[PDB]
């Protein structure tokens with residue numbers, strides 16, 4: 001058994017994407033926790049862990065077909081200062097990922113490979129859920145007010 | 160053995176500093192708790208207890224080298240009415256302490272005394288963390304708004 | 318407080334090194350587990366997690382001094398096919414890291430910054446222990462024999 | 475509801491295949507346990523039980539569509555004496571099964587029947603995992619050596 | 632994102648169908664329990680709850696794609712007096728639902744939307760099982776005998 | 790990894806010192822317990838065990854740098870029949886050890902070796918504490934009176 005080259009190319013693209021996402025999410029988690037904002041930090045931390053699990057599963061699969069995982073590349077990473085910028089960066093990344101996932105699932109299942117198609121289907125469902133949450137939070141921030149919004153996620157620790 | 164005089168002088172200065180810090184912190188804790196503000200009172204009480212432990216360790220050390228602790232002198236104490244003033248006073252005190260600690264560690268480890276240098280290093284790390292927290296809270300107050308800020312640390316028990 | 322630029326440069330270099338090490342270790346862990354050598358996969362996973370913790374500590378420190386962590390670049394990554402090659406790659410990486418750590422600790426503690434020096438001291442101790450273990454295992458493989466050695470790591474479960 | 479004839483034909487073929495696989499795996503389990511290689515007998519017994527569950531599920535499905543299960547015929551069964559021969563026989567069987575599964579899934583989902591397609595997809599995933607394990611063990615035997623390999627599965631208890 | 636209109640139309644139709652099914656099942660459960668027949672009441676109650684949850688999941692999905700759920704329209708509801716009539720009504724409803732589900736899954740997965748296709752696949756499996764059980768019970772009633780059949784689902788609780 | 794010769798020389802000196810200290814402490818513990826004095830025996834026993842741990846740590850370290858531990862030498866051992874003489878011997882030994890430790894830490898950390906410097910720092914702290922306790926007890930004996938002092942560390946057992 002030896003998966004065709006194009007399947008491996010798509011798997012490698014998705015792996016690199018998930019890696020860059022992991023890096024971005026962890027950096028944002030730290031940089032938010034540093035400022036006092038706590039619950040946002042916890043949420044982003046859990047999100048990063050989930051993306052880590054994604055990367056692991058994709059690596060295992062791409063390795064089962066007699067392939068060569070690519071742990072050397074990385075796409076551009078973005079950073080922000082306020083909240084709106086962080087949320088917008090995350091939304092952009094998720095949109096790109098979803099588009100790639102759909103195109104790949106189509107072109108792949110058109111060649112009799114099924115398990116990889118199922119993997120992509122699961123990843124797609126999860127990424128869609130995540131982008132939905134992001135959009136909801138962004139709309140909320142837009143409505144309430146940046147200061148009045150932040151005013152509800154700042155708590156003093158237990159010294 | 161018996162440590163040289165300059166080491167003892169530095170230890171005594173640091174001891175007096177920690178004592179004044181304890182006094183200021185407890186006064187601020189009480190004066191904040193009285194107004195309704197609660198979580199700030201808890202935090203400040205904890206910090207005061209930490210500085211107490213600091214002073215205890217420093218006095219033990221300064222006494223091991225055949226010295227004469229100085230429990231008779233205090234520096235100037237500051238008080239405020241709003242939150243900004245309290246935080247600024249605390250920040251100033253911590254900055255002064257940090258500078259003294261660094262200079263002392265240098266001049267001390269340049270004379271073959273190690274344990275005191277380690278004590279100073281620990282104290283320095285702790286004061287670093289504390290000044291960091293103070294600056295963070297001050298920036299937060301600056302951004303949100305004094306009233307809107309206080310509006311989240313008030314409470315009633317009964 | 319604002320740490321001087323050179324301290325930040327050294328911290329960033331060490332951070333990038335730890336990141337590349339994490340990546341290499343996890344890749345090797347997976348690629349070894351895939352073949353049946355489980356008892357090696359376990360150790361390698363543990364080491365990768367340790368390097369993760371190292372990276373987090375360095376990030377926090379470099380961020381406390383009003384700096385700009387660099388999560389964008391990586392050094393070269395190496396891969397092998399047998400065991401000897403993996404061990405040799407890891408040994409090379411650790412040697413480089415140790416040299417950098419020593420030079421940095423010196424040039425740093427020469428400027429009245431103590432906490433970062435202590436961080437580097439801890440990291441150095443750990444990396445030294447690890448390189449020692451690697452050298453021991455390599456000598457053992459050299460003596461016994463690749464076949465014999467492998468013959469005691471397979472599990473069949 | 476009445477599934478078309480071709481779906482039933484494919485289901486019956488897969489059922490017969492799983493039955494022959496069950497028989498082969500249990501025979502090999504016994505014949506290996508008899509010689510002392512216990513740690514292989516355990517694995518083979520578990521594998522046989524898994525194939526048994528496969529057969530049960532396929533029978534239930536083929537019976538829900540108003541069909542006639544075929545518990546009367548069997549394909550050829552192979553036996554060996556060493557380990558390499560056993561592993562090679564199992565590998566051949568799994569390859570054949572995988573090819574049939576893929577062709578069937580395609581021709582089936584092209585006719586608006588979904589549940590059977592899902593059943594085949596699950597069976598395919600499992601058979602693929604199994605063939606992977608077989609290939610790994612075969613390569614390990616190739617490398618170490620029959621004597622060495624066998625020397626780590628005898629129990630004496 | 633924004634799901635195309637046809638996907639939303641199919642989702643709304645399926646939602647309305649599941650709602651009418653919920654209503655019919657609960658009415659039948661009550662009307663059977665009232666007469667003494669107990670185990671049939673329990674079974675129908677459980678099935679009604681299942682169809683409820685079905686409707687809930689479909690509503691959530693149709694709402695995630697920026698749609699407008701339709702909780703205002705219902706199809707026709709049927710009632711009976713004996714058991715045969717109830718079972719036949721349920722069988723008819725399930726057949727219709729199955730056909731709709733298949734056509735929808737096809738036309739939907741032909742447009743790059745996957746999650747909705749998976750939802751429909753699950754619903755289809757469940758409706759398959761249910762129609763199977765209905766047909767089995769109907770054949771059993773046909774064979775044994777209506778009176779002799781009922782004679783085994785009565786208890787002294789009323 | 791190969792520590793320079795001078796570091797190894799200092800480590801060996803300290804190892805031999807700790808060994809002689811262990812021997813002296815255990816001999817004194819036994820010789821005190823024999824006479825009826827109990828709590829003194831317990832204290833000295835605990836101190837001997839602590840010095841044992843010291844020796845073990847130093848041996849491990851000196852062996853990590855590709856060295857040759859020296860378990861053949863021993864410095865002159867002292868013994869006294871009274872109590873004051875015991876305390877004075879212990880005080881002398883500790884003073885010598887402290888001086889050596891300080892000089893070694895300096896000359897060592899002046900050559901880019903950190904872990905050994907940390908080991909010496911810990912040992913130095915401990916020896917400081919011990920000499921302090923010894924001096925305190927000696928002053929107490931000087932004040933109260935040998936008879937009075939002995940009168941509070943005797944039991945029936």
Ligand code: HEM
Pocket residue numbers: 019022026052053055056339340343366369370372373
């Ligand atoms: C100090 C706490 C932690 C830090 C700083 C941390 C950070 C990281 C980072 C940066 C990665 C990058 C992986 C990559 O780039 O490929 C990673 C990987 C991973 N971490 Fe952690 N993590 C922490 C806690 C944990 C713990 C405690 C576990 C498990 C017990 C865990 C599970 C994982 C897993 C499963 C991966 C897989 C990465 C991959 O497959 O590529 N994390 N971690």
Ligand code: HEM
Pocket residue numbers: 181185208211212213214215216218
């Ligand atoms: C105005 C109120 C207080 C003042 C001025 C005060 C002052 C001090 C001082 C000066 C020391 C140590 C001085 C030295 O070591 O030379 C100390 C030790 C200590 N006191 Fe307080 N104290 C106060 C309240 C309290 C209370 C109410 C408690 C217990 C309920 C308490 C518990 C302690 C503890 C635990 C320590 C030792 C801390 C450590 O070991 O780290 N203090 N106090």
Ligand code: HEM
Pocket residue numbers: 657680681682683684685686687688
């Ligand atoms: C005329 C009678 C009833 C109607 C029309 C009705 C309606 C509904 C509907 C439409 C849902 C949404 C369920 C879903 O999303 O799958 C629901 C939820 C639920 N119903 Fe009812 N209900 C009725 C009676 C009851 C009663 C009396 C109970 C329990 C005593 C019950 C048990 C539940 C439960 C447990 C849920 C939770 C749904 C979930 O967690 O997914 N039903 N109800």
Ligand SMILES: [Fe+2]
Pocket residue numbers: 018021050051054123127
């Ligand atoms: Fe992901």
Ligand SMILES: [Fe+2]
Pocket residue numbers: 177180209210213282286
């Ligand atoms: Fe302090």
Ligand SMILES: [Fe+2]
Pocket residue numbers: 335338367368371440444
């Ligand atoms: Fe590291």
Ligand SMILES: [Fe+2]
Pocket residue numbers: 492495524525528597601
């Ligand atoms: Fe099977």
Ligand SMILES: [Fe+2]
Pocket residue numbers: 649652681682685754758
């Ligand atoms: Fe339904």
Ligand SMILES: [Fe+2]
Pocket residue numbers: 807810839840843912916
């Ligand atoms: Fe010692």
